């Protein structure tokens, strides 16, 4: 976790996770182009064993 | 090759027959262990009522006081020393007993509750001396009103005396 | 298929009969282990008296002093060094023995109390040097007055000498 590569790889794993069904939630505020901000439900694969192709 | 040769090889050894029967024994034991877990889980979910009181609520103090009062003839008590002021104007030591940690059984409202004093685990908490002590009310049944009546009686007794 | 075929398959192997007999052995062993727990719990709840004294009460000091005095010929003691000021005016070393941690037996009022000096566990406590030491009074019987008499005698002896 001491490298920026950790953050980049975590982001890429969250994005390309196929249909992983062992995710964990992550709440963030997303600013819409209309000028308002709404809650954003983003899922990160929970710790465990995951398989990609 | 792995299919045909092994079956002939297994059939050659008469100990494999005893060994293969032992495989059924091992599978049955694993099945037996699994059956216990699901049965216990279902029994707890469908036929038991549980109420845990943490140390971070005033309800904990009220329920502890009510348990100290209504303890029947429990013989697993712990001492508690306090100074009591008599109406004469002087103060004398008060030997008060509180049920020591363990499994205690009560007969409130014709049931058999299994009140238990959870002990200190890691000495971490807030708003107290950090003992992380708790009490768990377990009983056989489905109605929740028993514990609600217990809590209301505890509050009434706290407002009493 | 799972019902009919397996019944024939298990019956085909004579080791299943030995194995299924072993299943009963496992079931009996689990029942025997559970039977011990319920018996112990019932015996403790119905025929034994327990009194725990933590180190956060002055009752702990009084009870410790009374145990040190009235220990009969206990041979599991621990040393405690102090200075005693003689009536002559000078002071000399005083060797006093306190029962060392362990299980000790007394014969107070015709019973056999099983006093036990609880040792330091995690070095956490308050109002003391944080050893978390305690004493447990275990005896066979139903009356509670024996422990109260012990506490009163301890207070009297503390007020004595």
């Amino acid at each position: 976790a001491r490298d920026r590569s950790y953050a980049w790889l975590l982001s890429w794993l969250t994005r390309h996770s196929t249909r992983t069904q062992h995710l964990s939630v992550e709440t963030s505020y997303l600013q819409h182009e209309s000028g308002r901000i709404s809650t954003k439900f983003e899922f990160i694969p929970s710790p465990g064993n995951h398989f990609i192709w | 090759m792995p299919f045909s040769d092994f079956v002939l090889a297994l059939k050659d050894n008469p100990y494999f027959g005893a060994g293969f029967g032992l495989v059924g024994v091992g599978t049955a034991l694993a099945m037996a262990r699994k059956g216990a877990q699901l049965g216990l889980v279902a029994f707890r979910r469908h036929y038991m009522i549980t109420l845990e009181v943490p140390a971070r609520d005033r309800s904990y103090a009220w329920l502890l006081s009510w348990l100290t009062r209504h303890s029947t003839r429990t013989q697993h008590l712990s001492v508690e020393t306090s100074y009591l002021q008599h109406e004469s104007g002087r103060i004398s030591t008060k030997f008060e007993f509180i049920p020591s940690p363990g499994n205690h059984f009560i007969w409130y409202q014709g049931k058999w509750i299994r009140v238990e004093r959870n002990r200190d685990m890691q000495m971490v908490d807030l708003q107290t001396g950090t003992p992380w002590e708790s009490v768990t009310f377990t009983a056989l049944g489905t109605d929740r009103k028993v514990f609600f009546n217990i809590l209301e009686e505890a509050r009434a007794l706290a407002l009493q005396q | 298929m799972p019902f009919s075929d397996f019944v024939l398959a298990l019956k085909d192997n004579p080791y299943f009969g030995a194995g299924f007999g072993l299943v009963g052995v496992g079931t009996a062993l689990a029942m025997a282990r559970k039977g011990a727990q319920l018996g112990l719990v019932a015996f403790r709840r119905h025929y034994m008296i327990t009194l725990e004294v933590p180190a956060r009460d002055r009752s702990y000091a009084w009870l410790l002093s009374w145990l040190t005095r009235h220990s009969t010929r206990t041979q599991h003691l621990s040393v405690e060094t102090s200075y005693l000021q003689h009536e002559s005016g000078r002071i000399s070393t005083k060797f006093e023995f306190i029962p060392s941690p362990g299980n000790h037996f007394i014969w107070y009022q015709g019973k056999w109390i099983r006093v036990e000096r609880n040792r330091d566990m995690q070095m956490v406590d308050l109002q003391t040097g944080t050893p978390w030491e305690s004493v447990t009074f275990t005896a066979l019987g139903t009356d509670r007055k024996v422990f109260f008499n012990i506490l009163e005698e301890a207070r009297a002896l503390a007020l004595q000498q």
């Binding site: 182009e33 209309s34 000028g35 308002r36 | - | -």
Partner: protein, 106 residues
């Protein structure tokens, strides 16, 4: 929580609810100088309803207010009444805290 006002507080580095939702104070129960409450409500409502005017000109979409006066004139009460009127929640912040730092404040 409708019909009431929720008040948050700084718990670590997040906003957490403080107590139970307080009951709303009616806006007319606060009597300020003639027309001041109307002006403030109009300003804040116009700011809320028009984010496009801010976005199309690049101005950051923020706004801040200052109420100053001798004690006992109705600042905190008016803030509570306005929060009730706009159905907003109040995030109490104590600048003179001990755990507050610049990064934590941001």
């Amino acid at each position: 929580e409708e019909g009431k006002t929720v008040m948050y507080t700084a718990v670590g580095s997040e906003w957490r609810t403080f107590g139970y939702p307080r009951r709303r104070r009616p806006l007319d129960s606060v009597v300020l100088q003639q027309g001041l409450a109307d002006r403030i409500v109009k300003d804040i409502r116009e700011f809320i309803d028009n984010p496009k005017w801010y976005i199309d000109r690049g101005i950051p979409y923020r706004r801040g207010y200052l109420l100053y006066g001798p004690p006992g004139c109705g600042k905190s009460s008016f803030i509570t009444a306005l929060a009730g009127e706009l159905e907003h929640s109040i995030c109490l912040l104590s600048l003179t805290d001990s755990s507050l730092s610049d990064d934590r404040l941001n």
